Amino acid sequence: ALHFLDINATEVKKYPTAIQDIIINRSFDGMIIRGVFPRDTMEQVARCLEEGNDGGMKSILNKNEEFGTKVAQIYGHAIVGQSPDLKDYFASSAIFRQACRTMFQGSPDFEEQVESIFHSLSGLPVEIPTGPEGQTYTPATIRLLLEGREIAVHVGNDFLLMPAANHLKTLLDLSDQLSYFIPLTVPEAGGELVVYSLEWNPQEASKYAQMQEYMDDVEFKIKSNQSQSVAYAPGPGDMLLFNGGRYYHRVSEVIGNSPRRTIGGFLAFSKQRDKIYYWS
Numbered sequence: 001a002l003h004f005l006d007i008n009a010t011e012v013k014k015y016p017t018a019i020q021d022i023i024i025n026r027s028f029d030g031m032i033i034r035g036v037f038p039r040d041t042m043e044q045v046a047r048c049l050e051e052g053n054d055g056g057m058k059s060i061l062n063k064n065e066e067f068g069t070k071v072a073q074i075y076g077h078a079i080v081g082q083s084p085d086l087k088d089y090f091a092s093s094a095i096f097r098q099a100c101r102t103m104f105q106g107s108p109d110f111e112e113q114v115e116s117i118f119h120s121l122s123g124l125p126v127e128i129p130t131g132p133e134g135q136t137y138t139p140a141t142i143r144l145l146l147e148g149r150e151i152a153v154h155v156g157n158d159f160l161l162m163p164a165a166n167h168l169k170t171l172l173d174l175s176d177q178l179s180y181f182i183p184l185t186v187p188e189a190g191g192e193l194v195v196y197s198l199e200w201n202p203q204e205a206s207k208y209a210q211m212q213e214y215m216d217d218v219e220f221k222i223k224s225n226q227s228q229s230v231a232y233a234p235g236p237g238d239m240l241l242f243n244g245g246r247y248y249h250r251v252s253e254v255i256g257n258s259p260r261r262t263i264g265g266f267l268a269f270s271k272q273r274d275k276i277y278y279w280s
């Protein structure tokens with residue numbers, strides 16, 4: 001059984017060990033934090049993307065057409081699936097940070113507001129990681145799901161098995177990463193985050209040839225309702241923060257003409273749990 005807290009952003013300082021409780025204690029699995037950003041700010045940013053006065057965000061839009069017409073588009077490169085050098089990732093990350101700061105117009109600033117939230121929920125400093133040669137990681141990416149598009153089932157801790165994670169693994173604790181995201185725009189129907197009770201299990205995955213054959217068996221448990229699940233659909237400006245590192249999750253197919261737009265990434269403890277890093 002998955003357990004998600006629901007509070008308004010005004011209350012976050014009353015939960016100073018929430019991130020510790022999700023990752024280490026595992027007394028619960030996620031939170032909906034209502035109104036981290038005002039509705040007007042979300043609309044403003046959405047309009048920037050739609051009109052094109054987006055601080056150069058459209059210059060780093062990846063349509064992902066090579067992976068079919070059934071997948072999310074993404075502004076900025078997400079680190080998952082990148083080459084170990086991260087050269088393209090770092091280039092797009094710098095642009096993403098610029099454009100994001102421009103669009104939010106400090107009302108409130110995206111990075112400041114998100115860092116404020118994570119700080120309140122942990123009592124710890126919060127930082128965007130720096131690359132081997134001083135490059136900035138991106139704090140977030142924006143995912144765009146048009147009508148009929150979805151995000152296939154996956155689990156966050158698989159990132160640790162990817163070459164792209166080489167550098168981050170020198171900075172992060174061994175524990176679970178969390179996912180965080182905030183809708184900019186929400187669809188008419190569908191586009192729900194579905195989290196399953198099925199957990200990350202590298203011992204079972206290692207007893208297969210490739211990940212496609214293992215994921216087929218994971219898919220069979222999901223399609224047969226063997227695993228318990230909960231669906232979430234946070235509103236614009238609400239943050240959804242959960243143990244995506246541990247639990248398999250997906251975003252259901254978008255229904256209607258109105259696209260689902262979400263800004264977010266991941267977070268995890270530093271080696272000594274004296275700091276939180278966040279990135280996408």
Ligand SMILES: O=C(O)CCC(=O)C(=O)O
Binds near residue numbers: 262
């Ligand atoms: O809906 C999103 O923006 C991303 C969903 C997801 O897989 C995650 O938050 O880790």
Ligand SMILES: [Cl-]
Binds near residue numbers: 155
């Ligand atoms: Cl994930």
Ligand SMILES: [Fe+2]
Binds near residue numbers: 154155156179244
């Ligand atoms: Fe995810």
